[PDB]
Amino acid sequence: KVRPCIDLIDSLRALGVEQDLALPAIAVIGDQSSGKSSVLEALSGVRCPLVLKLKKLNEDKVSYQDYEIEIASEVEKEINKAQNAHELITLEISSRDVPDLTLIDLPGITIGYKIKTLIKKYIQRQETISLVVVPSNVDIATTEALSMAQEVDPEGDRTIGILTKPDLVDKGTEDKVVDVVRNLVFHLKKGYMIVKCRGQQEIQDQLSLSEALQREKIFFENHPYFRDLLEEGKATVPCLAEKLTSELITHICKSLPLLENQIKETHQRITEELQKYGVDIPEDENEKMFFLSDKINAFNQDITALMQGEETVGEEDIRLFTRLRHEFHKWSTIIENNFQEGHKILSRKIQKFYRTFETIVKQQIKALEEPAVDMLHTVTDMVRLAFTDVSIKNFEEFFNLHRTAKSKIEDIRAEQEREGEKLIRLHFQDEQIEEIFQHLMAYHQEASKRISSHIPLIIQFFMLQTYGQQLQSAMSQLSQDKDTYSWLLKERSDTSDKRKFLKERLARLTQARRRLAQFP
């Protein structure tokens, strides 16, 4: 309760988690000449977002990005150095008088469009308490500070007001200031406080900061309007310090369960989104082999589905096997047309008044040779298209795997298609082997059937079965050649990087859980 509640969040902040996760905080809103700079001086005792981690010392540190310096006089120079070097700068101070309190200071309001958005970036989170610093003589209605605070915190339930430099309050309107601090104008759950600090003329001398601590108490003890606010514990820096730490702790404690609820669901969101980008490539050579082999197996199964007309397809389209059945139907029609036209051609020679007629049927049969070979070509093209479309679906992220697959797909096409043409072509050399009209016409039906049957079977044999077979064999052999694993498993840098960032994000999220679970 004492100090740990604060130690908790700040280390979660040091985790770099704050980008994935909202951490309980007091954000310090600065105005134009609000003198906020001086108020922090009062608490600390000594621009892109500054984190003030304050710890009060018996026994008796600055970090820009990764690096740090150690000592209290030198602090001023280290600050301005780090800046020149929107990223968090943390400052940890420890002395007997400094409060136990962590604040985050933002650039004061005034390329301005950007500062609002930076400020809004912190303020809009219901886990942020907006700590508004405005000079007390100016109307609070006009101040940009409150307006921002109000834009984000409509009900004033996460905002705290600091009125500054109560000297320059126009005489006659002291009671208006008192109504604001007493909460009578714009109502804040967490309230108002008023403080007096280092003005223009003392910052030039820079007389001692602890002497100023005694300069407040006599300003408020003697002031006729504000003496009443001190009796009510709403005036001075030491009072301000106590209230802030009281309020911070109350916030952190209130916030915890809704936060442990928030980390879980974020963890999920990252892990769900992490799924879409595959998995890591194993360091171990053997695990590498199993990884590649599994990838080969799924390619090889998608190829298999094609071979069997089993592959999963769209509602309108049809399976490759079926598309080849339609080619094969077109082919039968070609046989049918060839058969009858040969019938017409033969009657035009027999009643034109033996082996002259044998030759004529033979020529009618040979004419089918090119339809057959075209069909060979037409079908390999379909399968090649199919096989490469599988290689796309499986190996896009692994371009060498895809490159290699394509290469085999092409190499085995050239080989199988050659073999298929050979057998088709040779089939039409093997073929040279009114009672005459019939004998020839019956001979003609036999030959066609032979041809109508074998040609598709050869096409199917070489360009679908043997083709798929060999390719699968070829791919499966990649797993034997270990010194190519490094090349084959090279993957796209785009998704390779996307995964890398998420794993890092998820890592920091996991540490967070760990430290949060440790605390109770």
Residue numbers in the entry: 48 to 93, 104 to 114, 116 to 118, 123 to 133, 136 to 149, 159 to 183, 194 to 436, 451 to 530, ...
Sentences from the paper on this structure:
Myxovirus resistance (Mx) proteins are key mediators of interferon-induced innate immune response in vertebrates.
To verify their architectures, we determined a 2.9 Å nucleotide-free crystal structure of a monomeric MxA construct (termed MxAMO1) containing the following modifications: (i) deletion of N-terminal 32 residues and part of L4S (residues 533–561 inclusive), (ii) point mutations in interface 1 (I376S, K614S, L617S and L620S) and interface 2 (M527D). The overall folding and domain distribution of MxAMO1 shows a high consistency with MxAFL. Moreover, the infrastructure of MxAMO1 hinge 1 remains intact, and a higher quality of diffraction data compared to that of MxAFL revealed that the previously unexplained K644 of α3B, a conserved residue among Mx proteins, is involved in the BSE-hinge 1 association by forming a salt bridge with D363 of L1BS. Altogether, the MxAMO1 structure indicates that disruption of the oligomerization interfaces of the stalk does not affect the architecture of MxA. Hinge 1 is substantially attached to the proximal end of the stalk via a hydrophobic network which allows very limited relative movement. On the other side, salt bridge pairs involving D363-R640 and E632-K644 from BSE and hinge 1 may act as a key bracket that supports the BSE from hinge 1 while allowing a certain level of elasticity.
